[PDB]
Amino acid sequence: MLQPKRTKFRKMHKGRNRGLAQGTDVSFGSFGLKAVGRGRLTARQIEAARRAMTRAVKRQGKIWIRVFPDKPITEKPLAVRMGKGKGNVEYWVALIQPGKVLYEMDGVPEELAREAFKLAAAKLPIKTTFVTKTVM
Amino acid sequence: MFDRYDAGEQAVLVHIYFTQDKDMEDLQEFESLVSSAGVEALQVITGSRKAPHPKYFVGEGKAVEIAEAVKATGASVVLFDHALSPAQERNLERLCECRVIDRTGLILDIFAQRARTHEGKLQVELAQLRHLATRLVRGWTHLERQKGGIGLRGPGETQLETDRRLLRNRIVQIQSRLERVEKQREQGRQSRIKADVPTVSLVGYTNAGKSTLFNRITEARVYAADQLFATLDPTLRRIDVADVGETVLADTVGFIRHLPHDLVAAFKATLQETRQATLLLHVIDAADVRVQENIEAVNTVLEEIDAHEIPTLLVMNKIDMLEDFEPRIDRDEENKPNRVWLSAQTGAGIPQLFQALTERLSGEVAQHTLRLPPQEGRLRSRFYQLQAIEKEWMEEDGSVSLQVRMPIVDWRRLCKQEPALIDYLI
Amino acid sequence: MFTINAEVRKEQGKGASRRLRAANKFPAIIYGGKEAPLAIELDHDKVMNMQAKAEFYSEVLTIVVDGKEIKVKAQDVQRHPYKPKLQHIDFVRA
Amino acid sequence: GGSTRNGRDSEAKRLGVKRFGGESVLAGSIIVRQRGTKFHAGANVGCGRDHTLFAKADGKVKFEVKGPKNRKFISIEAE
RNA sequence: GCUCAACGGAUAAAAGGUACUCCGGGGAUAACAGGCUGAUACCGCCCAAGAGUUCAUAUCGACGGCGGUGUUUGGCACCUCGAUGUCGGCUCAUCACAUCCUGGGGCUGAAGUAGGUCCCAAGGGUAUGGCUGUUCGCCAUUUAAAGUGGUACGCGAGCUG
RNA sequence: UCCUCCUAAAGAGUAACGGAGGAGCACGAAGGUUGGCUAAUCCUGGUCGGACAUCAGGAGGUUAGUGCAAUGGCAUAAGCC
RNA sequence: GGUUCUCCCCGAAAGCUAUUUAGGUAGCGCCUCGUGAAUUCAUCUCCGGGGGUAGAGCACUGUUUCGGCAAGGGGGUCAUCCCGACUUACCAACCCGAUGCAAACUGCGAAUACCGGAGAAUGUUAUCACGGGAGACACACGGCGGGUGCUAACGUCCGUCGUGAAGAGGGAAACAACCCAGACCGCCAGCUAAGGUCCCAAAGUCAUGGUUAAGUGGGAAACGAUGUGGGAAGGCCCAGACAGCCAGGAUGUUGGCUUAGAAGCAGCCAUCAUUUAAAGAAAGCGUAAUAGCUCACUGGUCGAGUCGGCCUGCGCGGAAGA
RNA sequence: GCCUGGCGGCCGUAGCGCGGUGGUCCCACCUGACCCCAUGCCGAACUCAGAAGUGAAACGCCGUAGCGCCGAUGGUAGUGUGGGGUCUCCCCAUGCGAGAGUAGGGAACUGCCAGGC
């Protein structure tokens, strides 16, 4: 799930992770989960965190997923020898940099938001924090 | 492997459990549940008296037809109805462009889709290990092409005997895991029985309205659809009866038409609660035109799990849909030993089922009132706290008579070793 | 009140900014459009405590730099990515 | 099915660098495979074929941006 | 005049078997074992949707997360190809504790009996047979129990083949 | 064997059983010169015309096109008569 | 496989191309000897350049998320298109604002490196050309930039640098490749680099200021916690501050609903203040209903400190092998 | 010294939009075409011969920032060299230093020659 429908090329290079994140601030909603840390979030992890928050807020308020898994992470099978091409495309991840806000939410109070975001934070591998909207 | 077949993929409709020599002619019976499996009925291929060839388990004309159907539809998987030998399956998948996945392979796939717990997933994993063990050697031949036959030194046994031993170690491990799950089920059984709590287990044909019977009884929502194995997991909700008192019902997963014996043994190793149930709630449906083969097969499955020998309150489903004969309440005997034909899946037969709960509990009509102790206020408070009676009446000289009675227990506490020096009863 | 003591920056650059945040100051810039910009350093905890209130950004704010009481307003905020701290603020003279 | 194929080249870039004393015709920019982003103005017309810019006179290379479309042009100043 | 397309083209012209093999070399290169790694495997912990009459944590744990071991399938080809004998059984062992029994405890959805689960604990103990070459496995009958792993998947200058 | 892109680190180069695609031609005009002209796409009104034909107007500016892969190109057009 | 006496000087490579080639060989690059040549070559400074990498960015190519609204398409009544009954509380498509992704995207674009010119200083002409003799074309690790793998490996394949190879010596317990530094010989002479000064074992049981109480130092994550040290704020206060502690706490609110339980014990209506130092149509645990407890508050005289969160330094548990 | 036409430099502070304004000096329309020449038909366009008329359109000029466009300072990212912590990543010293925003700028400037007061 949460895989792009059309992709220009099937497999993509492994790459390295960027230094920091753009998209730090909360703009869609009042309350947010901002990652403090570097990592890869899988699509199953993103789905699990969103499911945790929506069960917590009980279909009240709106949840925004501000990240999307566009990175094809490819894995070779068991008992296969090295070489003989790249591996077949097994899952879709999103590279998370420090400072990236990943989830926004509105229409719930601050304590409900903080509980929902901590239940997401347990699911995600990266370390995260609660952030709130500010005026500039 | 963690990778699996893609859901929503096209498939042909040749594979309809056994078309012949098992069940009956039941094209439609497998067709409905495979629509529940998720492949749409674009084109159906049917074969009569299909020749059990040593080479393919089918004649070449039907092999050409099923190959043409799968390549014309563009379906990812070729499908075979009869459970066939792995080598004939290998010959057929060599002849076709796409590989053929077995009968029990797709039945395991739909079982894994319907399974939402690790206990059911462990049962499916055991049967999947059985099916994969049947087809491993033909699969491992292409791997041994890459191996080149190397590995002669070391394991001094025959070749693939070592990997057969590895599969056997998988069998040993999953036997240990299923024994652990059975230990958890035994702990749950010791939890649910208190030597005074009647328990009923809901069995029968799958998605035959037995879950809807539980829904009407307990007012707890069940999952009901055209799909088979919509209801899998048992849930236990307490309900109140006027005569029985307190009872609980657990919705055990039903049987497909002719469950395989491997699937029977798998769910029997998963749960023993059907055998350990004091009473059984069996719901038998007339969905097939030929009901008797269904009753015989499902009752033999119940005897395999030793639950038919437990008294079964038989629920005669589809009978209310036909309305050939109507449920009635009559006090014919104190046991009332009549086969209850009520179809309470719509809830039309629930008062007759309440009298059937009276028929399955100890239900003496005469109902001899117990002798009242001189201290009756504590007894009245206990009666009001446990179950306040719908009708309260008092006999002459202060005697209180009510429907719930415990005569043998009353005898044990009122006269075991007591001196009876006062001798109020003469 | 919303009045901050700030110091005019003796040195300017990447190393100067990092040494300032190590010494618990953060840089800021004041531009007016009628005279030259002035680059200042301010104590991070004080400007954080004032920016906690929204009236930091809403109304005018006064800075004292070298004894000149300069009235100014918050224009742009640069915050640290994964921490409470703020790196820089850009000020429009008012 | 197979992805391992590539063509070979060993020059497709500039050679004179705005201070060459390029003599007679010398390739300013060889196999550039384009004309607009490297056109020729000063040493009459270069760019005969394959869009290789050759100096029509001896002198120094000049790189400039000129024109409405802001294209950069290679010229040669004679002494 | 060249699908001399093995495209810097051996000649105009050329397929295989070898367990009957032989020679010169290689640990430059697979099989055993060791070694790095630990994806997989085993064990543990994190969140707790829930099943449990109600009650997330008596006992299980959904979707996901983080580790530990070297312990199964693998990855690599560092070591030995101027030789490190292959599974299994017999004889004899020795260690770790992720404890099968016996010992000491906590919770229990622990009345007693009997249990489940977890903690501490390595002193000792921890079957005989039918089948099959078998480790296994299934079966018969025991027992307090018939532990799990390491030791060149312990042990062929100890035995068997 | 050859061509194009990326790997390839802003000169050139650069490997793998790395990730994607092509070629083993075509045209004596699809070549040379001279003269002339610029398209995708949408809106509106109209023949047996309708998401889609042929026309007229307005937006849009190369989003077209290139004999064939991709990259570089291309208004002086290398695009079209 | 072996290849036999000595001393002095220089001193590589394990790459590219091709090969019936892959452990061989030829050319070139690299080594050595000889001859000739110009301030040739190098460093640095200044002046000329070209780029599309890192980074950014979202116009283009694809990809995303939200908020706006219909051209047309399920449909909502419609064998009502109503040339009008709203264009359904559907997708609106372009579009417009806001947010991200890219090796095969660029309206931007470095540091570096490369090339060219000029100027000193320095270098045993280091540079080029021709000729004589070769070896080598099996590389390893480490740092950086990457492909592949699992952001595995003492893995595999590249670019660049360093070291081994072919380099001893001191350090890292021992240790090709990591750090320091390049051995002509001799010295029972000093100074020092890395690393260290309690004994093994040469040199501080040095001086000052602070930290940790686990042998952290001297193996390991998510996660858990009134460990301990700082810092900036917040609530409260001798018109009295922090716990436990003794009194009150409504029957008109106890009115119904699985009935002599109706209320707060499934659920709902309901939440006036009378006679508020200070009183809930009871929050929780509940009570056989009936009991209760702690809290809205005051005397509590115990009398100056007490409650949580944020950032940060070092500790603790997670943490089991033959 | 005041405007129009041509040819250049410059190449969005140079363009687009909005509003006004100009006359046969120039320019564009305009009047005809069996002449020169022309249309896969097209005095559309191209030409030629020119009488009336018009500045509408086009064109030019003026004002307008509504946009395109330019655009600091400061900060950030990156990176060469030396060193440090070295889960994939960072930090320190030092030298260089973006892009994106931000304030602001912004309705072009200039040369040569012909015609008219």
From Swiss-Prot, chain A:
Keywords: Hydroxylation, Methylation, Ribonucleoprotein, Ribosomal protein, RNA-binding, rRNA-binding, tRNA-binding. It holds the Pfam family Ribosomal_L16. The modification (3R)-3-hydroxyarginine is found at R81. The modification N-methylmethionine is found at M1. GO terms for molecular function: rRNA binding; structural constituent of ribosome; tRNA binding. The keyword Ribonucleoprotein applies. PROSITE patterns: RIBOSOMAL_L16_1, RIBOSOMAL_L16_2. One of its GO terms (biological process) is cytoplasmic translation. Is hydroxylated on Arg-81 by RoxA. The modification is nearly suppressed when E.coli is grown in anoxia. GO terms for cellular component: cytoplasm; cytosolic large ribosomal subunit. PANTHER family: 50S/60S RIBOSOMAL PROTEIN L16 (PTHR12220), LARGE RIBOSOMAL SUBUNIT PROTEIN UL16M (PTHR12220:SF13). Part of the 50S ribosomal subunit. Cross-links to the A and P site tRNAs. Interacts with assembly factor DarP(YjgA). Binds directly to 23S ribosomal RNA and is located at the A site of the peptidyltransferase center. It contacts the A and P site tRNAs. One of the last ribosomal proteins to be assembled in the 50S subunit. The simultaneous presence of uL16 and bL36 probably triggers ObgE's GTPase activity and eventual dissociation from the mature 50S ribosmal subunit. It has an essential role in subunit assembly. Belongs to the universal ribosomal protein uL16 family. This is Large ribosomal subunit protein uL16. It comes from Escherichia coli (strain K12).
